[PDB]
Paper text:
Dissociation of U1 snRNP is thought to be triggered by the DEAD-box protein Prp28 (4,5), acting to disrupt the short U1:5′ splice site RNA duplex or remodel protein–RNA contacts at the 5′ splice site (or both). The 588-aa Prp28 polypeptide is a member of the DEAD-box family and includes the 12 conserved amino acid sequence motifs that define this clade of nucleic acid-dependent NTP phosphohydrolases. In the present study, we demonstrate that yeast Prp28 is a bona fide RNA-dependent ATPase, albeit with a low turnover number. Prp28 comprises two structural domains (referred to as RecA-like) that are splayed widely apart.
We report the crystal structure of a truncated ATPase-active Prp28-(127–588) protein in a complex with AMPPNP and magnesium that exemplifies a wide-open domain arrangement that is not poised for ATP hydrolysis. We grew crystals from a mixture of SeMet-substituted Prp28-(127–588), AMPPNP, MgCl2 and 10-mer RNA oligonucleotide. The crystals were in space group P3221 with two Prp28 protomers per asymmetric unit. The maps revealed Fo–Fc density for AMPPNP•Mg2+ in the active site of the B protomer, but there was no electron density corresponding to the RNA. The C domains differ by virtue of a large rigid body motion around an interdomain linker segment, 402GVETSEP409 that results in a 45 Å displacement of the Cα atom of the Asn577 residue (located at the end of the C-terminal α helix). We conclude that Prp28 can sample a broad range of domain orientations in the absence of a bound RNA and/or interactions with the spliceosome. The nucleotide was bound wholly within the N domain. The adenine nucleobase, in anti conformation with respect to the ribose, is sandwiched between Phe194, on which it makes a π stack, and Thr198 Cγ, which makes van der Waals contact to the adenine N6, C5, C6 and N7 atoms. The eponymous Gln201 of the Q motif makes hydrogen bonds with the adenine N6 and N7 atoms that we presume confer adenine specificity. The wide-open domain conformation we see in the absence of a bound RNA suggests that RNA engagement is needed in order to trigger domain closure and capture of the triphosphate•Mg2+ complex in a productive orientation by motif VI of the C domain.
Residue numbers in the entry:
A (entry chain B): 134 to 468, 471 to 583
B (entry chain A): 134 to 588
The structure:
Amino acid sequence: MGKHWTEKSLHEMNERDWRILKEDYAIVTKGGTVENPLRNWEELNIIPRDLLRVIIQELRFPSPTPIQRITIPNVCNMKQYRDFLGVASTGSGKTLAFVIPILIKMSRSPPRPPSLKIIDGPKALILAPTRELVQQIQKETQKVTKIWSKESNYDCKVISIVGGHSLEEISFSLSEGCDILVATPGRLIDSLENHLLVMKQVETLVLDEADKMIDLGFEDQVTNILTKVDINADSAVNRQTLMFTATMTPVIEKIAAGYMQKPVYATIGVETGSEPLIQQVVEYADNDEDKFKKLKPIVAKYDPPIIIFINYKQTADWLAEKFQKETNMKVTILHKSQEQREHSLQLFRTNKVQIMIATNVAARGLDIPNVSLVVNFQISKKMDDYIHRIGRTGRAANEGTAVSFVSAAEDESLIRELYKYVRKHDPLNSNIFSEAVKNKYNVGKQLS
Amino acid sequence: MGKHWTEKSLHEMNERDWRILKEDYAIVTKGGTVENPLRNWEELNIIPRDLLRVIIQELRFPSPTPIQRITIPNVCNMKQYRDFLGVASTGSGKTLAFVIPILIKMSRSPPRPPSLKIIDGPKALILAPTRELVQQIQKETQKVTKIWSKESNYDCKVISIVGGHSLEEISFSLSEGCDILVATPGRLIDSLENHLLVMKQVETLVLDEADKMIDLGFEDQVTNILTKVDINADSAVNRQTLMFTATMTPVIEKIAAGYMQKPVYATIGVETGSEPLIQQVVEYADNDEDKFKKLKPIVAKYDPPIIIFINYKQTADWLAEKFQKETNMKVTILHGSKSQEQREHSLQLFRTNKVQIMIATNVAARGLDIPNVSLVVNFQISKKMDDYIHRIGRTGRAANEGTAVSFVSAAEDESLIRELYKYVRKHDPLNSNIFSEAVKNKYNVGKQLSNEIIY
Ligand SMILES: Nc1ncnc2c1ncn2[C@@H]1O[C@H](COP(=O)(O)OP(=O)(O)NP(=O)(O)O)[C@@H](O)[C@H]1O
Ligand SMILES: [Mg+2]
Ligand SMILES: [Mg+2]
């Protein structure tokens, strides 16, 4: 029997219950002395009644998202205002995961008079990599703050600073001061350089999609901003730093290490991203004859262009022979064979020829058209190559199929990786991984 | 003996004369096969008559500046359109130093019709860190190109792109084509990424105030642009690169290595490094008591060691008594007339924190091993700026953040306060320097309105 965590009250929760809840929302943490995630909005009383009413009654958000669950109780503690690093993909309530703590923090002090907002600048600074993201964050924030202003004592001003707005307009928009400022690093820097604003009173600094900011070349801009806010800070100000990234990198570690003080580290969900629409089908075949006999009826069912990958030029030639003499399909080869190979590609792109049989080397950096079918006649040594290969189909929202023949002579570790992959990336719910391959390589037998 | 270079024809100049001329304008060069600098605008006939007329009569520059002297003959040098790295301050006249060569180069081909400018993009691209500089550069260039356009068939469009510009506005600005594009790097990247222009034909690329571009954080954007320019160039396009900086750094060196080919290197004047990260604070005070009253909360918050400068020894004794009576800071005094033993004792107390505050008169601390201090206080400013600069030198040493606080009364020389305001406005690495309104009003200094919304 038992009693499930959703049936318990807070007191009754044990450590196994917390483990289960964390798994339930794919939250993984570390850093020591980590607060448990919210079970709901209400019970810890972290969120003040007015704000809570805005969230539950006005916006109708009955429950927190995972990232909000873990972020809010770790970032809201008058005790610590501890730093936070979250690894989570865009969306799923990330923005309010950090905007809610900023509001809570604001509501634990009397409202700043307007004149003071003008003299002192923002209490929160949010950095994001693009104008679009910045504007999206401002709107998502004002969604709450616009209502909150009508339902409480706080009149929160959200100003954004982005490319495409003159220094003059930025300066004008700052006329009634600012509580939360949202900016791209570049334009924020342009703004400081022209003395448009002071940031001596910033209590929460947020770095959102930090990996994307690094990717776009903003590392030095970001670290300059961090250093500048640290130096210019009023000494009575205590500043909390929050960082969100979809992935972890050496650069992100470097920044965390350099600018954050003993932070909570959390992973939330998995790294999201594009799923090619591919049916992966892995089948066992003893030798090249068996392979070809299984392949023949498959190609009969797929519209050209079709591509077949091999590893040895001899096998390519053999396979072309088989196709030419045993079906009515026109092929073309690719090694180390042609420099005018773009002739062949041109045959293929225009459907003069239906099947291309190519090695990895020969086909890398060629514009292959979207194919209906990839055949891995000989498996690659590296998963990188398998992924690049099968990527030749399933592009631009069309469905594709990738069939791979696995013999008795393949790298076991590779086959393990491939099994995991075929299970994990199954958007069409139709991926096949042969039981015979499972047996030959002792892989994928275990139940969940 | 020998006749002085100013008395000679160009063809009579020997190597010693060139050495002397270069020392006269503080020009130092390397990189091999460096051309001699201009002795005047006219001699060499590098600059065509109409353009020279504009420069002298219209822009009012009868003589070239040192950076112009060395830059122009090294980048306008058929046969080789050589790359160039100049180390020089604003405002040493850099702008014309690179604009003159761009125009001269432009004048060698027929004007392009707008449709073709659009198809191929600018012939010259100039990068600068701020809107203010980009707009300056565009204005200076346009003074010439306006004239060139009215008085000849050369329409030559000089477009600026800055961070503040919407894609709409950039589009409209680019709508009749562009010959010289002056841009901030981030926004240039946004423009390219949105297909607002191309860059197949950039023959001259100028990176102005490159050290500042790096300091603001733009190294990757600049690199990305250099790369894109080089990648999209037509085959027959030779791209000449000029880079100007106020200081030399390993990053600048690295960019020169990666993106320039056998450049001429030149330094004008005494090369300086980065500015000490000192915050300078100038504050008003009616008298000494009031100075001390403002000083109490200040020395309460800065970590020892702290150094305080005065002009008269009597003031040192006074100050020391007040520190003893009103603070918990212990002090040592150098007034100038103690033994080297005593002065070394004092200095030892100071270095080992047995005392927190050293009080020194104008030259009592010169030549001694004063540790880096967190705070320098000018209790009585010196009569001369040299001493001010020397004193604030005691802080912000070795890449540290430093603070210098000066109190002025109404008894100072007005010209000194004027110089001081200039110095405090000019040297503000941290954009945090404070020059009190009280001092401004009392001396009628720094009260000139800019007549600009932003500047
Ligand atoms: N706890 C919550 N419960 C329900 N919905 C929420 C919660 N938090 C946020 N949302 C909303 O769920 C939607 C999807 O989340 P998310 O993608 O993060 O928002 P967003 O993309 O930043 N804002 P938007 O572009 O207007 O959809 C948004 O409209 C959020 O405001
Ligand atoms: Mg969304
Ligand atoms: Mg770097």
